[PDB]
Design a protein around this ligand. Sequence first.
Ligand SMILES: [Cl-]
Ligand SMILES: [Cl-]
Lengths: 766, 766
Amino acid sequence: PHEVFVELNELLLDKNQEPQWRETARWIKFEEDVEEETERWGKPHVASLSFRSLLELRRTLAHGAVLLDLDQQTLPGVAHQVVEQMVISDQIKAEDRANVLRALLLKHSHPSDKSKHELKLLEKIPENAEATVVLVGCVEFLSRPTMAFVRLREAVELDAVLEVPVPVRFLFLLLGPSSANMDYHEIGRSISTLMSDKQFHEAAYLADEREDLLTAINAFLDCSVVLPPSEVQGEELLRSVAHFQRQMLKKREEQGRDPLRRTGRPFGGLIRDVRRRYPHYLSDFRDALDPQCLAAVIFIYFAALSPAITFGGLLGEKTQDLIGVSELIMSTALQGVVFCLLGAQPLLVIGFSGPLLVFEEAFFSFCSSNHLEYLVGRVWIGFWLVFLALLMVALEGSFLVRFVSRFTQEIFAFLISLIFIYETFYKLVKIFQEHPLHGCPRGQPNTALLSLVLMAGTFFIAFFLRKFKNSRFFPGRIRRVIGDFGVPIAILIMVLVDYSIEDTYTQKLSVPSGFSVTAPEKRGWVINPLGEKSPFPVWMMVASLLPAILVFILIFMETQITTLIISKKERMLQKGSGFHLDLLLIVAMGGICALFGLPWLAAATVRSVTHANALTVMSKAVAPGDKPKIQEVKEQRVTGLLVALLVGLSIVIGDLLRQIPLAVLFGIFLYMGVTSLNGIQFYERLHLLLMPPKHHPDVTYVKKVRTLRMHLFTALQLLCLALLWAVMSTAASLAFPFILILTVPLRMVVLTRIFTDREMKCLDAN
Amino acid sequence: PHEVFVELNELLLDKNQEPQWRETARWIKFEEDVEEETERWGKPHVASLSFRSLLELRRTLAHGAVLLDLDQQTLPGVAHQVVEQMVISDQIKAEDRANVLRALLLKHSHPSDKSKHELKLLEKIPENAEATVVLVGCVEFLSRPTMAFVRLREAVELDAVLEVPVPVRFLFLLLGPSSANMDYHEIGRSISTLMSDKQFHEAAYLADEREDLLTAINAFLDCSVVLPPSEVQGEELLRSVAHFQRQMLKKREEQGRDPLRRTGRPFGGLIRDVRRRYPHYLSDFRDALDPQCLAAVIFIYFAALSPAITFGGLLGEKTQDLIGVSELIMSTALQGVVFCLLGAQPLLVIGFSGPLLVFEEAFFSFCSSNHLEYLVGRVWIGFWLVFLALLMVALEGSFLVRFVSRFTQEIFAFLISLIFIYETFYKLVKIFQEHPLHGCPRGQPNTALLSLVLMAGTFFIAFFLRKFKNSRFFPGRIRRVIGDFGVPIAILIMVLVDYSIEDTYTQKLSVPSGFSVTAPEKRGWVINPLGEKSPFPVWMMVASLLPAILVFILIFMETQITTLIISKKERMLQKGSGFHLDLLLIVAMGGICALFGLPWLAAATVRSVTHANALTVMSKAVAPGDKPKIQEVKEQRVTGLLVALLVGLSIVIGDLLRQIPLAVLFGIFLYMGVTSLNGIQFYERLHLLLMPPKHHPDVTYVKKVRTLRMHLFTALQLLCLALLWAVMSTAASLAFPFILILTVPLRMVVLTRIFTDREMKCLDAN
Ligand SMILES: [Cl-]
Ligand SMILES: [Cl-]
């Protein structure tokens, strides 16, 4: 039981007709060949071998010389024993001993003739592996081909046969005349592909006699596929060539023979989470002393600051400056420090979200249309939120996230993107009416077109940098670093361009100077739950439960979905999960912060995923040609605390934030809206509605389902989304969380009634 | 020597528990399988077959009944005879005759249940072919598997076994007990893949016993590849399989055993061209009575109108309206009509080109700096061009185009694109400098920004609609039709948008009313070749030979490169070629029209290729999984004559052409400049300087040459291009065609002594 590294050496004249042994190929997991006219290693590929070479090898292996459990530790002795066994096996006469022995002892040469190559290659080779050398060559002083196979008792590192220091266990000799129409390079390639797979080398390990090696090659042959002699193009191999192998292998092997659970005790989930996460406390403050940790704070800081200022600008221009940039910054800083010191999943980034923005819009519209204070109703909403969070934590109910499937999540994401796009286009439509494009802040000449130019420029700069991040240019290290700084670069470039122009007027941000409210003449710092100016009605202190339930539904959905996605198993997350503590902390802080007139926050799934990806380390000991794998994720609660502190210390520099026009922020808004459409399995199904059935891909939800049924599924999803969008534009746009809550069981019951069970496993895969 | 069609029928069970034979796969060139749970044909692929099935088939064929030269034309009779010689071959007992006979006579069912699909499959199948039927099934009332093979004396159309009315020659029968360590579907696929290649089905006709079949299957086996049981991705199948089969097949077959020609008689090429092309004159006018010609006429009209008006706008804004849109249109119409009536290659579209524009502006700069008349020098330049064209055709010097390699052509194309981009950006900067963006046809408030908006909008629409032409949306017929009209659609949309705005001033075109010169104050219609206001110097008439050689070099290069590219063997052009006649006509009529103050024209390679691609017919009788091939090209001289007439009649709609701003034209200019950078290997190798060696493609100029030598080649090309640009930037820009043609001796002498012969065959491939 070991791992094998195989290398093929051939007898080829180097420069001055000296014989020389030259390396030609190398097998770790996949074959790599050396180009003859360039002398450099090619790309890895599947070792495809002919069938005549296999028969020639099988024919010649029967008459070969076999030596088992040899006791030599140097090439002299091994070669002498091999020659003696050859001459006593009636393969060569007693006159060719000297010439064959001379041919055996020569100088091996390699293309990369411990330097950098050995250090780099020893990483990709497994930790403790044993090596094989295949020596094949054409000899003009022989009559018939001769073969020898040896297995050493103890692994021995030979002097220079191999390019790297790996102990050698197996040797293969094949010398013969150029006649008999035999291709020795192909036979060597066949032997090296034989010795580089698990079954054959395991069978060769406990091999006692000659014919035990013929059974192994017979078993190798009845496990492979055969391709007929005809092909034209390259998309014909993307088909079953990879599916046929898996199906046949599964047939061979088949014929060859939690943090989400109701306990029953009150607050059981809290106790389990606290006793699972908190013991490993001092570790989270120690694994932060790494270069990667301090290189992730900057990008996370920018990615958390840009949406904060954008959403603050939109809220300030919409909420009559009751809540603006300063208040969002204070809420993000205050609630990002407490969570990262007490929460059980410090990889979540707490911030504002689109659904919360549209709910605030709807509640403001409700309050204005009925002449009620907007900041004293939020206090009672927060109180009821605190009560609701306590009650569901008390009776474990976080298992309800298991009932939310892809069907609802994709509708949610699509609606969020649509409202972002609508907001951006509404803003520019409104710009062109304040400043009409007539002849020679109500009549400025060059404002509307310059706003359009800024918005388009900041979009098109971030688009072609997200594109560049995914490309193949530059070193991979630097490409990843530069491609990680797209939005700040676009914002800085557009701000500099706008600052160069010193004649035209454009709207700017409204951040104030020092620790102050955005509207000091309107509100103070604490909102008394009895009425700022007029007394609050006594019938709304009780009837504020419904908006509390709706906002709780929104917060629960986003936070629990984020915690589900982050805690997947493919990501090596080992410390634990916070399904019950995170929700309690988030909702309690959201309820308390409403007393001071600050907004509610959520989990911010995309930012959390970005933060999780910037702390992963990829294993470098991966053989060429296989995909990279996650080594581990560095979990700690220092980077989140630092980001929360840094976001808070952005009011003291509010002088540099007043030079930023609103058009740049709305361009970044639209860029975030369009880019989020990727990754949801509803956008491509909607793309499939316009292509002919010949061009549909080979994804799992296409091969198993007829076209019309898939189109029916997509039509039902579109109908649900359109019904959700109709309610939002009316004067009763305080029920869309209820509409999603309705589309959950509607989905279950009705779509179970219509579609079969087999179809709802590919169209609605978990 | 014939073609074969194979269909696999498997004995299954339906919902009614009656057996029936059900079609499962189909072989024309590549396999297509029927999905079980969807009942539709999958995509074609290579028939990958396992190795155990081949051994099982060979083992079974060792004892079986062979029915050679059967003489019956019904399925009952052949079934009865097959059973009769099965029961006498000691394969099945005499008690199972009735059961096997009952099994054979059943009902065949296919998924496609004449018809439209029947007609389509008739088209896809070759003209005259024979059918093979493979009937494999598991039967519960036999002891051992049984196989029979027949060959009918005469091809017979069986009743309903085939989905297609194709005569049947062979049929295979294989019935055996269930669960006998055999996969009968896989054996059926093995037999059907055996029967669907040239060698096996060619050797099946000349068969006498089972020994011939065994020899044929042995010869089939040592021509295939074997894939070991290992794979992770699909990028690794691209390397081994396609490149390895070609090498093996070439080894098997290797070990298995003009218009450009000097004559000597003056005007020989003219005589040859006239005697070759002119006899097929009546066929050039009766071939236009096809539906595809009219759509081609419309498309080429829209493709040839826009560059004419754009170049006319640039020339008018640069030549002080001495030459404008009207003169461009008149010259284009006259030269097009004359060439289409008299030329030997009427697939060329004669029009203005970028290098001609550069030479015209350089000559204008030369004339202004010497206080000379710009319209009297052109008369003498044309007078010398006529004599130069006559002398070179008289000596048959048109073979000199054989010495122009990819080096010079790629340098030329890159320079043209660079000048287009520079022109567009210079005009944008000039527009911004004319109308600044200060506060409240010179000094207009919001003219500078509207021009930028219009130019960017038209460029982006033109780019994105060309992107959609290459996509996979809509029916292919409609996608091709819609995607041909990108530039007219962009121009129309931007013109409508600009027409909507009715308060801002933008520059427009300068089309005049009626057949008139653009500036009827300095020139008439006939230029006096003696001086209009002052006598022309005598020394300038003689010394006009120097500028008359550079323009000749430019015209010759463009026209002959276009005629070379068009007349390749891939495009099925059968009428002839016009190397020595089209050049004479073009240069003579360019020299003549210089007397009336009209510009010279050229061959317009891209427009000619577009006109050639719009008249070709794709073969529809091609097997699935095969690349389409050209059936023929409709060669006629009505399409070009109509386009030339239509372009000339664009003067009468000059009222509509005055509503078009210049920004839209400059956006189309920049789009044409950027989009031409494709197909140039210099651009591709310039991309590879920024890409790590790991990511370089598998093209022929990468695998066979080291990276540094490839980089040295690109550096030398860049140095030549930079030298040409620096020369054109100074006041000696009149002599850039001299330096452009000086890279032929450089390649022939200097680049030969640096790079070996092997390297200058993939880097400089013809
Ligand atoms: Cl987010
Ligand atoms: Cl062109």
